[PDB]
Write a protein that binds this ligand. Structure first.
Ligand SMILES: Cc1nn(C)c(C)c1-c1cccc(-c2ccnc3nc[nH]c23)c1F
Length: 112
């Protein structure tokens, strides 16, 4: 069960990194570079930054022990975006679309 579920999760991660979703996934590929982006309050507002390269590193290194731990990280990434940004900002629109992809496929988890 655990192995299977984590495979399911790595498939989701591979999809989120895929070219078919790149038009809205790209802001989430790497850690937010607060300084480069001029976002000098980012650290002060976001206490636990998260991005898809960090999730991929944690998957490769077998840090996730179960699907719930992986999902909590992916959702944290979206929540940080909803935290920091006005809800009408383009990056929030892209986060919502990528979360739709994630939640619909995560729902299709093998459950035993
Ligand atoms: C520059 C730039 N131009 N455009 C239209 C976008 C979407 C960006 C951009 C580039 C890289 C990362 C981010 C980003 C990621 C996660 N959270 C964020 N919060 C504010 N920016 C965030 C980003 F918006």
């Amino acid at each position: 069960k655990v192995s299977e579920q984590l495979k399911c999760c790595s498939g989701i991660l591979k999809e989120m990194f895929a070219k078919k979703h790149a038009a809205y996934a790209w802001p989430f590929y790497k850690p937010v570079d607060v300084e480069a982006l001029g976002l000098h309050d980012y650290c002060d507002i976001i206490k636990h930054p998260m991005d898809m390269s960090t999730i991929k590193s944690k998957l490769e290194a077998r840090e996730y022990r179960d699907a719930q731990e992986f999902g909590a990280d992916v959702r944290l990434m979206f929540s940080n975006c909803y935290k920091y940004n006005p809800p009408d900002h383009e990056v929030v629109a892209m986060a919502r679309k990528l979360q739709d992809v994630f939640e619909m496929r995560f729902a299709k988890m093998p459950d035993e």
